[PDB]
């Protein structure tokens, strides 16, 4: 069923930076692909920030990976119309520990 | 990286109490959560303590963990022991890139009989289920794919571990693999050898195993793991037996 339609993080948000699970952002380039940009999360540790600023192995940054809707090229190359898909992305880091 | 150093054995009369200690030859133990296996005769391990001296639901209180930070070294003690509790106790840590088992202790509860135990289930129990496949007999040098195929709880959200075991001998840490799939860990004697990924829209964690060695035959478990380290919950295994 095809229907018509019209027309970095880091910009607005230092979470990546203060975080104790802190990330590096990818530039995710795509032409093929709208939106063209994709910024990726890359947790910077295995272990979380504690109290002292010291990386701490008693808990994991982990990234959280959500599918996200994004437009794409339906005939390769040829930007005559595209599909809608969904890919999964490293939205940010958050700190996981055993002790619930 | 490092060793832990557990006694081969230990005796207590029951309803005594019993300390088992486990000493971290290198690294600060301090620094990395400690956990405490059972396992009785012909069973799967099982829980007692995680996270030095956390308690799962199921383990009776008498059970309790302990660290000393000063002789690097952390204790389980076992408090009005019964003969149910005759088993062989294994501690586990680990460190950034390795998870290593103690020898195991096997504790004797005086008195022969009294009791018994039973074995746990397969996924240490509740609603997560691990069920390994693909062992079987090879040839030194042949390959073997493992699976295991996991149900009851999101499971990119848990990081994954292969461990197995010979018949009669100890726990051997073999690979790890985060949630997400992106970052791998590998005992030593399996780099170049040994390959572990995950397919999280499947549930399904894998194990590839090239230039199997007569040493490589074990018993390998499924693991689910809180964090890098600290596992939770134990498959039932596969046999991989090695033999020209």
């Known amino acids: 069923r095809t229907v018509m339609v019209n027309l970095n993080p880091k910009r607005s948000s230092d979470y990546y930076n203060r975080s104790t699970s802190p990330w590096n952002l990818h530039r995710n380039e795509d032409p093929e692909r709208y939106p063209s940009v994709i910024w990726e999360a890359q947790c910077r540790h295995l272990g979380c920030i504690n109290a002292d600023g010291n990386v701490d192995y008693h808990m994991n940054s982990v990234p959280i990976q959500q599918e996200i809707l994004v437009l794409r090229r339906e005939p390769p190359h040829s930007p005559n119309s595209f599909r809608l898909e969904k890919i999964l992305v490293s939205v940010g880091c958050t700190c996981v520990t055993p002790i619930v | 990286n490092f060793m832990l150093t557990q006694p081969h054995s230990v005796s207590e009369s029951p309803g005594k109490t019993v300390t088992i200690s486990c000493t971290r030859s290198?690294?600060?133990?301090?620094?990395?959560?400690v956990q405490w296996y059972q396992q009785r005769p012909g069973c799967s391990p099982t829980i007692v303590i995680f996270?030095?001296?956390?308690?799962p639901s199921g383990v009776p209180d008498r059970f309790s963990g302990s660290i000393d930070s000063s002789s690097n070294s952390a204790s389980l003690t076992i408090s009005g022991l019964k003969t149910e509790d005759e088993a062989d106790y294994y501690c586990?840590?680990?460190?950034?890139?390795?998870?290593?088992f103690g020898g195991g202790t096997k504790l004797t509860v005086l008195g022969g009989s009294g009791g018994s135990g039973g074995c746990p289930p397969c996924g240490s129990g509740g609603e997560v289920q691990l069920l390994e496949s693909g062992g079987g007999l090879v040839q030194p040098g042949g390959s073997l794919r493992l699976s295991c195929a996991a149900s009851?709880?999101?499971?990119?959200?848990?990081?994954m571990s292969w461990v197995r075991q010979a018949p009669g001998k100890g726990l051997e840490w073999v690979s790890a693999?985060?949630?997400?799939?992106?970052?791998?860990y590998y005992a030593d004697s399996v780099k170049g050898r040994f390959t572990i990924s995950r397919d999280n829209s499947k549930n399904t964690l894998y194990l590839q195993m090239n230039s199997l060695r007569a040493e490589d035959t074990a018993v390998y478990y499924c693991?689910?793991?809180?964090?890098?380290?600290?596992?939770?919950?134990w498959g039932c295994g596969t046999l991989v037996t090695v033999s020209s």
């Open positions: 693991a689910r793991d809180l964090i890098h380290g600290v596992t939770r919950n």
């Open positions: 009851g709880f999101g499971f990119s959200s848990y990081a």
């Open positions: 693999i985060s949630g997400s799939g992106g970052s791998t």
């Open positions: 290198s690294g600060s133990l301090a620094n990395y959560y």
């Open positions: 996270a030095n001296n956390q308690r």
């Open positions: 586990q840590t680990y460190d950034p890139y390795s998870v290593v």
